[PDB]
Amino acid sequence: LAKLLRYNSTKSVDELTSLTDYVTRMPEHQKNIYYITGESLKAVEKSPFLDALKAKNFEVLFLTDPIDEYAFTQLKEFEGKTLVDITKDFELEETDEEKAEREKEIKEYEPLTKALKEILGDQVEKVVVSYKLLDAPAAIRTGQFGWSANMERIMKAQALSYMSSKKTFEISPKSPIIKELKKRVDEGGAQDKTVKDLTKLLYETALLTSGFSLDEPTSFASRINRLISLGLN
Amino acid sequence: LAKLLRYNSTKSVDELTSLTDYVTRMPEHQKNIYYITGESLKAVEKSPFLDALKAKNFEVLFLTDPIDEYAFTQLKEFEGKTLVDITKDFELEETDEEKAEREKEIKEYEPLTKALKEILGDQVEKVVVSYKLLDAPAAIRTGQFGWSANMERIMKAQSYMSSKKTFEISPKSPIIKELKKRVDEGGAQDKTVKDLTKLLYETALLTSGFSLDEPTSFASRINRLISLGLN
């Protein structure tokens, strides 16, 4: 059942592997089994959620078939807890030193997160600075109660109504785009029009990057065209 | 999450009700929250799985939308466990009274259940006599930990290893009672037996939301039967 042998992984592309094989390759200090859910191999392969995991030498399983997606949610553990990393996880508290050094950096960034919460409005449950996010300015994490992008995808054809999920807008503090927005926001930029349009544009990019799709793409498109037209005089 | 108010039920047709409403209507001796999934309200309304629950004064929620079905399987509990009864459930420890009266009967049906397993072959994981089934000769129960019949349908539209289906027979049906006689009279591979159980199993499939393997086999089986009423 769990020796099924039917998934690719960050530590095993081309050749298939089972869950029970994954567990042997786990380093001693890996507490969890990490996987990702998506439509296709090509989609998840380049997800910005992997980068934080790869940096810690942790393996991530690839589940393209929705049957596998449910299976893990009913099981929940093997010896360590299985979990989607599209949803909210806490990586092995990479040293207690950082967990203090962060609270400092997180503090001066809530004015930004506050402003972004206003600009984004109801479309997200939270706006948060995330350190699980590298090589990307922003991404969107499903809440620990909700819909993986892949699930939302399959249920969308058979619904819209009965709501959706509380999505969380993560921003990476090591990204130049976010670093600039903190400057503009900390210098009375919160309600400038160029800022607002771009964070909105930024947010929609995070959606596509994170597997979701846009509501009314024309609004987004016109945001794009506006921006590529800035360089035209 | 659970107060949404978006379901009909055996104790509430016409008017919509929430999970928290259900939980207050439960008698003190109900341990579980019972619901059922199906294509449409009209379809599930007459499911043969409901009869056993109503006879025990248990309310059953109606989940026709797969979104709602997904939610309950992710929720998994409220205080008592939510559960599909299309899948395999264990009825609230019926009583120490029955746990003996049945064990006798299951034995006297071991010739049939064994025989029926042979005619059906790999299509089912088990064949078992069931008392959760009244006013029907046979039905097909998805195994637990798995995908409800309705769910499998939606994901195919959007080897295969589907699910472990179980073929339940009611020892309380005349049709089943006859098969016990014939099988206890050297009937296991009698031809009338084989055709009838297969006829039942395919019906059990359709009644339970699944679709047929080789619909022609069923059809000619059907007409074969209706052609007996002219000779």
Numbering used by the authors:
A (entry chain B): 439 to 598, 605 to 677
B (entry chain A): 439 to 596, 605 to 677
The study reports:
Heat shock protein 90 (Hsp90) is a molecular chaperone that together with its co-chaperones is responsible for the activation of an eclectic set of client proteins. These clients represent key signalling proteins, which when dysregulated lead to disease, including cancer and neurodegeneration. Hsp90 forms macromolecular complexes with co-chaperones that can regulate tau metabolism and Aβ processing. Recently, the dihydropyridine LA1011 was shown to reduce tau pathology and amyloid plaque formation in transgenic AD mice, probably through its interaction with Hsp90, although the precise mode of action is currently unknown.
The structure of a complex between LA1011 and a Hsp90 fragment (residues 438–677) was solved with molecular replacement and refined to an anisotropic resolution limit of 2.94 A (isotropic 3.18 Å). The structure revealed two dimer molecules of the Hsp90 fragment in the asymmetric unit, but only one of the dimers contained bound LA1011. Superimposition of the LA1011-bound Hsp90 dimer with the apo-dimer revealed that the unoccupied site is restricted (especially by the side chain of Leu 674) and requires movement of a helix (Pro 661 to Leu 676) to form an open site able to accept LA1011. However, LA1011 was found to bind in a small hydrophobic pocket at the extreme C-terminus of the dimer interface of Hsp90. However, one of the methyl ester groups of LA1011 bound across the two-fold symmetry point of the Hsp90 dimer, and hence, only a single molecule of LA1011 was able to bind to the Hsp90 dimer. The binding pocket was lined by a series of hydrophobic and hydrophilic amino acid residues, but there were no obvious hydrophilic interactions. The pocket was lined by the amino acids Leu 671, Ile 672, Leu 674, Gly 675 and Leu 676 from one molecule of the dimer and by Glu 624, Leu 625, Arg 628, Thr 638, Asp 641, Leu 642, Leu 671 and Leu 674 from the other protomer. The structure presented herein showed that LA1011 binds to the opposite end of the C-terminal domain of Hsp90 in relation to the site suggested using molecular dynamics. However, this does not escape the fact that it is clear that LA1011 directly competes with FKBP51 for binding to the extreme C-terminal hydrophobic pocket of Hsp90. It appears that the trifluoromethyl phenyl group of LA1011, to some degree, mimics a key binding residue of FKBP51 (Phe 413), PP5 (Phe 148) and AIP (Phe 324), such that future development of LA1011 would need to focus on this key interaction.
